[PDB]
Amino acid sequence: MEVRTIKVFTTVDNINLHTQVVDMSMTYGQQFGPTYLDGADVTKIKPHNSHEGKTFYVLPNDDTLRVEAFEYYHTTDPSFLGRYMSALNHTKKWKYPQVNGLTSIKWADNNSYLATALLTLQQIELKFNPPALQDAYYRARAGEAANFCALILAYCNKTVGELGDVRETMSYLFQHANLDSCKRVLNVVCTCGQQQTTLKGVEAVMYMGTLSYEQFKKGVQIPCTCGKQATKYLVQQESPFVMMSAPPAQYELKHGTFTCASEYTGNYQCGHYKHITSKETLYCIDGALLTKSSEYKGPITDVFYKENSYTTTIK
Ligand SMILES: C[C@H](CCC(=O)O)[C@H]1CC[C@H]2[C@@H]3CC[C@@H]4C[C@H](O)CC[C@]4(C)[C@H]3CC[C@]12C
Ligand SMILES: C[C@H](CCC(=O)O)[C@H]1CC[C@H]2[C@@H]3CC[C@@H]4C[C@H](O)CC[C@]4(C)[C@H]3CC[C@]12C
Ligand SMILES: C[C@H](CCC(=O)O)[C@H]1CC[C@H]2[C@@H]3CC[C@@H]4C[C@H](O)CC[C@]4(C)[C@H]3CC[C@]12C
Ligand code: NA
């Protein structure tokens, strides 16, 4: 019945802080709308003794807080934060082992496709532009990837334990990186004329249909029997990596010719990714798990290869 307040801080970036005076009769709800402490919803938990001086993430309710979230996260999605928080709240009790000098995640909540994305992020050259991703990535490379993993989940709109694709995942991660200088040129072969595309940005590091890069630049028969069934070949690449992608098929991975690749077992209704990286030998990372051999054969879905500048000569 006596008035008893604490002092806390709100935030949508965890950096710019904001002094509030909070009442211990009233929920966090009734003051700041939805409020989170480290992933946990306090929207209902009344202001405790132990919460004084501590930072609560809120929802961009005012305008300053719109400006901060935008500048931090590059998105105005009405539920982004809550999506971050729900997921932060799982991913902080995930473990993140050093495996062969890279940060991976231990299997939890069907994070297989995340472990593999993470391991790929750390072997390819790419710069995120959302400060939020720059910070969390930096921490992730340091083995505290909890923040990082909750954001991916946030930015791809997957919730913890939800069915997950690596190709799409990385699309979403490509959207928010700087991949401008990225240029690809393509032409079509065989009867009936000949018509050229040249792709840019994400569209220029990503190809669906074949895992083999060499097979891209030699050509592929593609669905396009316009009268002979045409072949697709790369003419120019300008990009620091490339990402080839197909339906899961059995594929042999040859030391020293690619950088890293993604394997998948199961159907479209459950399954598991592993990651294969090419060092002094071939390393197969499965969450906390690490095997090796000289050769690999298996169900491959995406492969990554080192790039700078290829110009065709094939015609
Ligand atoms: C890396 C991503 C783009 C790819 C690149 O830059 O290579 C990022 C970086 C800069 C970002 C955009 C900046 C603000 C924009 C305001 C507009 O009112 C709507 C959002 C707007 C388009 C953002 C979203 C996409 C961007 C997130
Ligand atoms: C919705 C479910 C998915 C969950 C799960 O995969 O555990 C079930 C319902 C019907 C099932 C399909 C029925 C036909 C086939 C039978 C064969 O024994 C296995 C493959 C087969 C294509 C099934 C795949 C799994 C399905 C789609
Ligand atoms: C001018 C470029 C070299 C720049 C440099 O010296 O840093 C050229 C010359 C040698 C080429 C590489 C050889 C084929 C490889 C295929 C593999 O699937 C992945 C690409 C791979 C590594 C190519 C990258 C582009 C290269 C074309
Ligand atoms: Na290269």
Swiss-Prot record:
It catalyses: Thiol-dependent hydrolysis of ester, thioester, amide, peptide and isopeptide bonds formed by the C-terminal Gly of ubiquitin (a 76-residue protein attached to proteins as an intracellular targeting signal). It is a multi-pass membrane protein. Changing T5I: In strain: Kappa/B.1.617.1. Coiled coil: none annotated. It comes from the Viruses. A zinc finger (C4-type) spans 190-226. The active site is at S112 (for pl-pro activity), H272 (for pl-pro activity), D286 (for pl-pro activity). Inhibited in vitro by GRL-0617. Changing T76A: Partial loss of ubiquitin cleavage in vitro; no effect on ISG15 cleavage in vitro. Changing G256S: In strain: Omicron/EG.5.1. Residues 3-58 form the Ubiquitin-like domain. It is found in: Host endoplasmic reticulum membrane. Signal peptide: none annotated. Residues 72-315 form the Peptidase C16 domain. LRR repeats lie at residues 118-140. Zn(2+) 6 binds at C190, C192, C224, C226. Changing V67A: Partial loss of ISG15 cleavage in vitro. May form homohexamers. Interacts with N protein. Responsible for the cleavages located at the N-terminus of the replicase polyprotein. Participates together with nsp4 in the assembly of virally-induced cytoplasmic double-membrane vesicles necessary for viral replication. Antagonizes innate immune induction of type I interferon by blocking the phosphorylation, dimerization and subsequent nuclear translocation of host IRF3. Also prevents host NF-kappa-B signaling. In addition, PL-PRO possesses a deubiquitinating/deISGylating activity and processes both 'Lys-48'- and 'Lys-63'-linked polyubiquitin chains from cellular substrates. This is Papain-like protease nsp3. It comes from Severe acute respiratory syndrome coronavirus 2. The gene is rep.
